[PDB]
UniProtKB/Swiss-Prot annotation, chain B:
Present with 2840 molecules/cell in log phase SD medium. The keyword Transmembrane helix does not apply. GO terms for biological process: mitochondrial translation. GO terms for molecular function: structural constituent of ribosome. Component of the mitochondrial small ribosomal subunit (mt-SSU). Mature yeast 74S mitochondrial ribosomes consist of a small (37S) and a large (54S) subunit. The 37S small subunit contains a 15S ribosomal RNA (15S mt-rRNA) and 34 different proteins. The 54S large subunit contains a 21S rRNA (21S mt-rRNA) and 46 different proteins. mS43 forms a heterodimer with mS42, building a large protuberance adjacent to the mRNA channel exit in the mt-SSU body. It is found in: Mitochondrion. Belongs to the mitochondrion-specific ribosomal protein mS43 family. Keywords: Mitochondrion, Ribonucleoprotein, Ribosomal protein, Transit peptide. SUPFAM superfamilies: Fe,Mn superoxide dismutase (SOD), C-terminal domain. This is Small ribosomal subunit protein mS43. Signal peptide: none annotated. Component of the mitochondrial ribosome (mitoribosome), a dedicated translation machinery responsible for the synthesis of mitochondrial genome-encoded proteins, including at least some of the essential transmembrane subunits of the mitochondrial respiratory chain. The mitoribosomes are attached to the mitochondrial inner membrane and translation products are cotranslationally integrated into the membrane. InterPro entries: SOD_C_sf.
From Swiss-Prot, chain C:
Keywords: Mitochondrion, Phosphoprotein, Ribonucleoprotein, Ribosomal protein. Component of the mitochondrial small ribosomal subunit (mt-SSU). Mature yeast 74S mitochondrial ribosomes consist of a small (37S) and a large (54S) subunit. The 37S small subunit contains a 15S ribosomal RNA (15S mt-rRNA) and 34 different proteins. The 54S large subunit contains a 21S rRNA (21S mt-rRNA) and 46 different proteins. It comes from the Eukaryota. Pfam families: Mit_ribos_Mrp51. The gene is MRP51. Present with 656 molecules/cell in log phase SD medium. One of its GO terms (cellular component) is mitochondrial small ribosomal subunit. Belongs to the bacterial ribosomal protein bS1 family. Changing residue 165 to R: Suppresses defects in the 5'UTLs of COX2 and COX3 mitochondrial mRNAs. This is Small ribosomal subunit protein bS1m.
UniProtKB/Swiss-Prot annotation, chain D:
This is Small ribosomal subunit protein mS42. Component of the mitochondrial small ribosomal subunit (mt-SSU). Mature yeast 74S mitochondrial ribosomes consist of a small (37S) and a large (54S) subunit. The 37S small subunit contains a 15S ribosomal RNA (15S mt-rRNA) and 34 different proteins. The 54S large subunit contains a 21S rRNA (21S mt-rRNA) and 46 different proteins. mS42 forms a heterodimer with mS43, building a large protuberance adjacent to the mRNA channel exit in the mt-SSU body. Present with 2060 molecules/cell in log phase SD medium. PANTHER family: 37S RIBOSOMAL PROTEIN S26, MITOCHONDRIAL (PTHR43595), SMALL RIBOSOMAL SUBUNIT PROTEIN MS42 (PTHR43595:SF2).
UniProtKB/Swiss-Prot annotation, chain E:
It comes from Saccharomyces cerevisiae (strain ATCC 204508 / S288c) (Baker's yeast). The modification Phosphothreonine is found at residue 62. Belongs to the enoyl-CoA hydratase/isomerase family. Mitochondrion-specific ribosomal protein mS47 subfamily. Coiled coil: none annotated. This is Small ribosomal subunit protein mS47. Component of the mitochondrial small ribosomal subunit (mt-SSU). Mature yeast 74S mitochondrial ribosomes consist of a small (37S) and a large (54S) subunit. The 37S small subunit contains a 15S ribosomal RNA (15S mt-rRNA) and 34 different proteins. The 54S large subunit contains a 21S rRNA (21S mt-rRNA) and 46 different proteins. mS47 forms a protuberance of the yeast mitoribosome and retains a solvent-exposed cavity likely capable of accommodating a substrate, in accordance with it being an active enzyme as well as an integral constituent of the mitoribosome. The chain holds residues 265 to 492 of 500 of the full protein. It is found in: Mitochondrion. Present with 3950 molecules/cell in log phase SD medium. It comes from the Eukaryota.
Amino acid sequence: RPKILVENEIGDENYDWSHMLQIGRPLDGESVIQRTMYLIKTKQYGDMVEAYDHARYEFYALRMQEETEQQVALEEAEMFGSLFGVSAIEHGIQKEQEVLDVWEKKVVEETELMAA
Amino acid sequence: ALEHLKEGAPLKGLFSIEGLQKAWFDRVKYLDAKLNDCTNEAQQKPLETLIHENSKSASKKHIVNYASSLYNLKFSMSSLQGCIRTPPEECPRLGPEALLQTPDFNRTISNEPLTTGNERLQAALISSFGSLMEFRTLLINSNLAISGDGFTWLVARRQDIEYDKLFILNTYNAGTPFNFSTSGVMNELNNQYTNMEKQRAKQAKTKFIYETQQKGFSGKEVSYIPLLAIDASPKTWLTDYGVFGKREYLERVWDSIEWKIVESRLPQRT
Amino acid sequence: TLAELLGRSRIAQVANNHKPLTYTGKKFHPTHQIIETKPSTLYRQEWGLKSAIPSKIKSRYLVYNDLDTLERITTFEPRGGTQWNRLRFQEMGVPIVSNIGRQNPFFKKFNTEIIGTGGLSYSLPGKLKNSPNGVIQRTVVPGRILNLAAIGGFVADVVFFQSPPSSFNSMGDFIRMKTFLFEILEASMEKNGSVSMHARLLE
Amino acid sequence: IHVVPKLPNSKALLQNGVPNILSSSGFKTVWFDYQRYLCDKLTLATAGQSLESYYPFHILLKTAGNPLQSNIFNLASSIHNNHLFVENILPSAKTEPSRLFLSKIKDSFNGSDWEVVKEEMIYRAENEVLGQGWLFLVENNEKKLFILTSNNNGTPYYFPRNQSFDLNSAISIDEFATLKQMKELIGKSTKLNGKVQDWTMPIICVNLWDHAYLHDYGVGNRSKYVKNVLDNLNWSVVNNRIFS
Amino acid sequence: FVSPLPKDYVFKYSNEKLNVIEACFNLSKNGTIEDIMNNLRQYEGSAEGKAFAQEIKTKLLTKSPSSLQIALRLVQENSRDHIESAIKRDLYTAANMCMNQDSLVEFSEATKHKLIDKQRVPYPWTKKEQLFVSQLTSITSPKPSLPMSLLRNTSNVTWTQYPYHSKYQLPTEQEIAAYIEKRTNKVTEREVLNHFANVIPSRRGKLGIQSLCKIVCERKCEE
Amino acid sequence: PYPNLIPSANDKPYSSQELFLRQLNHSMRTAKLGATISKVYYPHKDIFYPPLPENITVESLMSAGVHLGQSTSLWRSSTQSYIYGEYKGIHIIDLNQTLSYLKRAAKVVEGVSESGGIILFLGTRQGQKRGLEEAAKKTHGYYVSTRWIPGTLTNSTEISGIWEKQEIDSNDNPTERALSPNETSKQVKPDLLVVLNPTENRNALLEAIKSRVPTIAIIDTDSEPSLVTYPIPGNDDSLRSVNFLLGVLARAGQRGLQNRLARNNE
Ligand SMILES: [Mg+2]
């Protein structure tokens, strides 16, 4: 999952780690960890490990929800006559194809060299 | 049409005295009247049969859509029952904070089939989905995702009326949960288009892809026996729960499912 | 304090590792955190790291080990292929389930082993996927046969009814050129974190 | 982070709604709550991505070609479309439709009247979209205008994501042929992303979602609502978004 | 070495509270604590501001009356007069408090109650009436009975106002008002802020100066 | 506007140019529509809207990336006082210290601009040019991106001999009279050299201290801080942190210029 490291105003943010989903921040392992730290501070889970597990379990549900959202959005798009010119797998195949073509010509030349 | 709900006093769980009416009684009236306007016949008959008759037809399309809309709603409402939670008229409407709340579907479980009998149904669900909690997450999250006019369907894979395996699918606007009625219509249209072009390969490959998508592991086609429907449209939940309380609504619906009906719908296993 | 801010901040968030950027061994899952820029930030060479990154890099994504080294260069590689593999897998839509009879780990001192899947799929197995044409029973995916088949950023075991001679024996070790369709049956995940797919060749 | 824009005479709108078409509550439902919700969702989707910096319209244009991340597109489309609709609605920031606009209409619809065009639009709205959607009057690279319906979060701008008709229901032969032609055109594009050129601009967006009408007009009377909107809309805004 | 204030910072004394303070505590030549109390009682305006005024009247009541009166007597005189004389006066009144001949400043007992004995509970007081002006003067003035003198500085200097404070702190309302008057003889808020935040060389990088100026503008001037 | 636009016929569709204009019009009016995007970093905004020295915080400096010093193995121990601690195999610059030094630097920049001194912004790294030029424009000042030819101040007559000098008011009006050949040939020395990469141009610094010119520099955790009059501890490698510091300095100098113009007017 790509990570942007270019900071927006660090002073402007104000995250209540009662929950994971903050607005300016995305959902990631960081958010989990912040939640664990919050739990530790508040002493809901006195143990660190238990708090971590809890945060992980909160994350998982959110991730599953995110996963379902995208798939159903795709389904909807398919139903209502949306048209996607290049799918991700198709793109990948195309990318592989150029490399393979490059390899083939080179490989033939190498075989010829070996023969001679 | 239904017995369990009425115009004066709605369900204590889900809807309110006005909000229920907006959701159900008015919608049904709108649909039936529209259907009557479209077709000169006033005989209701079965809705499913009508859909089967008039499917794969652009001229006889609107009527089919209206039949689907009517049927789906009815199916959704049959499943539902009363609940323990307070009415939304008493409670406050959820604000922008509802979006940021973590869902408890992963960790918590409630209102299972086991609590009111329905043991074999529960076992079937478990077999399909791994667990009850996993099934619930699949259902509710899918329903949330629909974001527009649609329905989430618990279904059973028809190969006596035997079934192979339980499943769940979403269907939108006025889409049927039955596969056999609409299976291969797009392929047929493609074939017609190719014939027209000829009269006036890649296309063959696309047709082959369509065919393999459609056809099952053995049988010539496949169909789905619906067991549970859950509506996703703003029409129902905007009145009581506002904009932000879709998830809350779905939770309430889930709490107030009558699983006995679902179990009865579920046929014998192979 | 400053220290607290540093601990919070986006460089501290990237968990450190000194694994090879060039690893010619078997790659079963991502090694390094992929790091993207925006186009604007790329235009003025800023990635949110210690230093500017060379103007030769025109890709928005990269991977790194050290913010700064003794050689006065950040140790990086401009590639984020692992995200695309994940996205391909998602597109394919074959839900990973443990073939061993066990509960799904996402539901309910430290264990460093991979909790279920590594997070390439949080999809659940019970769903169907409808379309205009109908409910898709068989997932159709294009892939390449190597000799095993490369299917959308994953190598997968393959099976068929009869081994086709016309396609295979015409070009014995140039089978990689021709893309063939596949029917993906199921995806299991082993202890080492390898996704063991199983496909079926269509003709 | 994406936040809702401050409308002109906001306090007045909150007090009343919109004189003719939308109530105080009905306007809140369509904008002050729903738009906010949409913005929040979009922020959640695109918090740490490169998409955070871009405006909704530009996000939609970026995203349109990608099959995955359709949720982002949907949200971005909704946000833009809804604000266009609100802009069309607003009383001020009496104005008549422009002479140029009328001439363009006449050129387009076989020399018909503006009332006739409105009537055709409302008929299209009634017939085409089931459930949710949008009703646009657009203008393309050929200077003539035309009516464009979309089925939930379909954009008027980019024709592959017009989302103009439902294949969940049965479809015609002509519609299928049109789809096939579109697909062919898309394939002809020949770029890595695979995105065609398109210069469709919306002139009168209308919001056929239930977040606008359902409070005031009930589950029926969506047509009536659409008619009311057409009768009372900001014409100065429309005129501004017409000329090249 | 300064730093900006946090983004959650709010100036404790709100505008309405400042206005009610201005209304109540501003007094004439012969003002009293009783007069202030009466003013607080009869103030009318915002509900929150009225509640505040009531609260401050209550806390005045809780505190000692004679000491408050003495303070009131001192402060006008000190505002009028120069530093050294004011200091001397303060010293004299402290001496009088220590050695109360007239027995009209229950101080030592109150201190014992508070500082020595126990932190909790206020003192009940045994003296509550309006002291005369001559009596007040006698309390805050010297006599030939006891000799009094400050210890000599190296810089034995005397002045009516501070030589170096006005430069190196946030500018008073009075100074802002004077500037506005000068400008008049159009004017706007932004221009005033620029003048204060940029033109004045001593107060270019003052921390919360623009905000202060804005508050002043809100309180006093009009469009 | 657009005088050479040949508009297409009414029966015909839009031309390419006409279509482009229509797109531009749409962009200006209704593209940035659906939402507004608060709290997000645009790179350009630090150059064209830098904050005043007062309003800068430690948090803003951290976001800029000013805290990230060179490396643990590339440590000049001369810079020890400035560094906060080490983390991720990198020395991290104490940022309160950075702030105070920046303020001090900003004040001296403002002062020389007020006095009407020649400020010179020196920045040999790749991306720095545009922001450097902007800063030079902001105060009526000067810059160097293409390399500093050794001896611009020490050997001024040979190097900077054949370039045009000017005259200036108490304001900044050219007052174009002819400079005499004796009047032209004298050196015109800067009153503030401000560098963005002191480690890369040691020579310029050496020239400045020989030529008796006060100098400001972004001292990283490998740079010698004694080589300059007013060091600002910070991250000289990243382009955006440098720009932020530079932009601040420019803003400080701009203010002082404005004040000078005001007092001239008075
Ligand atoms: Mg360096």
